[model samples]
Target chain A: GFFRGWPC
Target chain B: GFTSKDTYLSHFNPRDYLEKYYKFGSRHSAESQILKHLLKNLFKIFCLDGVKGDLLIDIGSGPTIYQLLSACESFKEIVVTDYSDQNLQELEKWLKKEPAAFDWSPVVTYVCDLEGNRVKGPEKEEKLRQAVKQVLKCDVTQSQPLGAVPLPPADCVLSTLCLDAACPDLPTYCRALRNLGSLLKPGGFLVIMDALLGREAVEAAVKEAGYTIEWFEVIEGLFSLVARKL
Candidate 1:
């Protein structure tokens, strides 16, 4: 969830 | 995972995140330190294939004999990616005096806010700089596809950290298992941030069918060496 790449 | 839950880093450094150390045995700390180093090394060589790269624990250590090797060997290019602008600035300070190929790229992705803290007075110095490129407003999570700018890949795919950083904890391991199966190509490698001791990091690597050549743990940092089925 904290990751920036996801759902980008 | 196992009964190793209550061990200390100075003892076993279990979860196997204790090999990257220069001299310090991974004592008391948290955070995936391994993913940080080995990824930095991987990126150095991938971006600057022809160039030479000496091992470095981090950009924070001013510059030592290792940097001297970098100055001598780095020919074509040098690049660095960071979550912290302050850290990038630290790198910039050295690049100004050390060599010519160093450049810093900041990605404003998903409003990471790490990317948000960018300014001139802090890090981006003036004068003897090679080049600087700041990609505007892009996030990596949902996009799944790369190729936005120069650093972007045509059909980019990265494995490790993408999944590990997931919130639910279960999704973290799942992402790792699936994503680790892919590759960025022969000369290219994906930089993944990871979590040490989390079973997902190790399990996913194996499930994806990668033979971890070697592993290292330093200062509680665990990074595994994995190559595509080549």
Candidate 2:
């Protein structure tokens, strides 16, 4: 559910 | 608003959700700014960067004339990736007049991207057409692998106004770790995000692995400069 924004 | 500005929030103005992130600073550690943070913040309005320059020497580097100096000297190719297209366009307009540092420049100018897509705007494509090198469109939150983008292995990578924009605290660090870890080796990251009283990016950086060089906050902007051990 939680993923990095710029890292995808 | 706080839970999902990550994706669904399009083209600005959505803090109707976690109105708090809007008012509160993400980093409050005048500790790091006083400690390791490198940049100088003029009140809560702007930031000025210089590695060997004096604090008094830099007063208006945030202006169009000086801004190019910050990027030109810091990296070979300056890639200013932002989610907003308008911001990108505005940057170009500002740079054209102050070519003092960018005249011989091949790698510069903003990238309008989410930081995931894989397509390079042509050198003649408006934003890039004006001899402004470095423009990419990609998912800002992606894991990796692509054309000369994402900043995986550089001496330093930075972010300002990042954490507050991301929704949760953990999400912020996770995003940081993902980016830092992706870098090849012996790299550094410079992050200038506002933070809460005691909670900030340090807890997240140490938990990930690299050594923290410095952390400081001026006014309300918290800056962290990290480097991987050689």
Candidate 3:
């Protein structure tokens, strides 16, 4: 999935 | 390990995703940078000059255009699709060069350098914007993703970054591949990206969907692949 591992 | 949590489209934050991933001026975000590098590397590395066509279709493009930065150079017309209106709206802002648009200049310049083109970033963006003829609403869950959009079979069909959101099981992934496959002209090309961990499963889906794997490799922790539709 593209939404991962980082805070936006 | 990657989470198997359902990727809720209704909650996707387009601006935040771009700001955190693709819009960090001088500050490099590995996620965005790696994708652009590999995207340029593969199209050039695999010598895909022969992959050019009249139309290139992309689906599940979340407010980001890194995947197609190289694609515009090869296609006369490109149509991008997204499930969420917010995604399409955000993507439109960039195409129209609106004031609050996400600045993709960094990745645009990087792609140019890879192509050995001396042209600047904004010019590159302009070329891509021009090639993108339409942005349509799509639903990957359906048999016809772009349902009734009146699209000609594309020369190239590129799907990326949404498998986890759209497919919960192997059969669904296979179905999704077939749906994407249906968008291509029989002899056309299909390029796909998914989390690297699913390499084996994705490979099976590719074959199951009547495509022969032309290139399949992990590029920066993601599976980057190209196949020829049968």
Ranking by lDDT: 3, 2, 1
CAPRI tier of model 2: incorrect
lDDT of 1 by residue, B61-160 (tens): 1211122122222322223332234334445555555454243332111112222334332132331134222212222222221224344221112233
* CAPRI-style grade of the A/B interface in model 3: incorrect
Q: What TM-score would every model get versus the actual structure?
A: 0.34, 0.47, 0.81
Kindly give the number of clashing pairs for every candidate.
Answer: 20, 37, 0
Instruction: Tell me how candidate 3 scores on lDDT.
Output: 0.73
Residue-level lDDT for B170 in candidate 1? 46
Off by over 4 Å in 2: A1-8, B1-69, B96-132, B145-152, B209-211, B216-226
- List model 2 lDDT by residue over B1-230, tens digit each: 23445433354456645663645533565543342232223111122333321111110112122223233333444454444443444455554544433342321222211112233433313332333354333333445522355443554444444444445456555554554445434434443444442444455554454445454543444443423323
For each model in turn, which proportion of the native inter-chain contacts is also found?
0.17, 0.11, 0.04
Worst 10 residues of 2 chain B by lDDT: B52-61
Report the C-alpha lDDT of model 3 over B161-192, residue by residue, as the tens digit: 66544434677667767888778899888877
Off by over 4 Å in 3: A1-8, B1-33, B45-49, B164-167
Candidate 2, DockQ to 2 decimals? Answer: 0.17
